[PDB]
Amino acid sequence: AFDRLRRLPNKALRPGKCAGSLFPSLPASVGDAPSVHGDFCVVRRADGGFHLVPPYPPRINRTVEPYPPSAGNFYELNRQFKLQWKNVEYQFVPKLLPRP
C-alpha cells in the first residue's frame, strides 16, 4: 500500500471565544488561550469603517471529491488562487492541515 488516496475529516470556520486574549504574557496553565477574532479578520471598509471579511481561501480541502455529481455543469472545478503584486509571485497555494 503506497501512494493511496486517503480522506480527512471536514472542518468549518471555528468561532472565536468571547473570553479571549491578544498575547499571553507568561501563561501559567498547561495550554494556549483562545482568540476572539479567530479565523476571521478585520479590514478597512469602503466608506471609512471596519468590518469583517472572509479571508483568503480557508484551507480548501482537495482530498474529498465533490458531493453533488452535477457540479461541472455550473462550476469550473480545479481552480487556483494565485497571489501576484507587480512582478512578484509567492508559492502559497498548497493548503495543508498540520497535525494538532
Binding site: 496553565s29 498547561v30 495550554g31 494556549d32 497535525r99 494538532p100
Partner: protein, 103 residues
C-alpha cells in the same frame, strides 16, 4: 463513557485519583535513550470496569525531552504535558529524576 450513577461509586473514584496528578503529571520508566536529548518514558495507567468490578493495567509509551540528559535507561522519572508540538516525536518535558540505575 460513564453514566451519572457510575461517577459516584468508590471503585471509580479510587481509580480516578490514582490516574490524576498535579498538572496532569505522569510516572514512568525510560526504555529508550538512543537519540540525542530524547527519552521514551513508559507510563502505566488504570481503568475501571463496571461489569465485573475489576481494575486492570495497560502501559502507555510516550516520548519525553531532557535538557541535561541526566536520565538513563531503566530510570523512573516524572513527565509534564505541554500545550504545543515540538519535533516529530517529542511531546513531553522532564522535571526531575526519582531513581537512578548504576551506570
Amino acid at each position: 463513557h460513564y453514566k451519572t450513577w457510575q461517577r459516584n461509586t468508590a471503585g471509580y473514584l479510587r481509580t480516578f485519583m490514582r490516574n490524576k496528578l498535579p498538572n496532569n503529571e505522569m510516572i514512568g520508566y525510560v526504555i529508550n535513550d538512543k537519540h540525542p536529548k530524547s527519552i521514551r518514558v513508559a507510563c502505566d495507567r488504570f481503568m475501571y470496569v463496571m461489569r465485573y468490578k475489576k481494575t486492570f493495567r495497560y502501559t502507555k509509551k510516550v516520548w519525553a525531552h531532557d535538557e541535561e540528559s541526566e536520565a538513563r535507561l531503566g530510570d523512573v522519572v516524572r513527565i509534564q504535558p505541554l500545550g504545543y508540538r515540538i519535533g516529530p516525536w517529542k511531546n513531553y518535558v522532564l522535571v526531575r529524576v526519582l531513581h537512578k540505575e548504576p551506570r
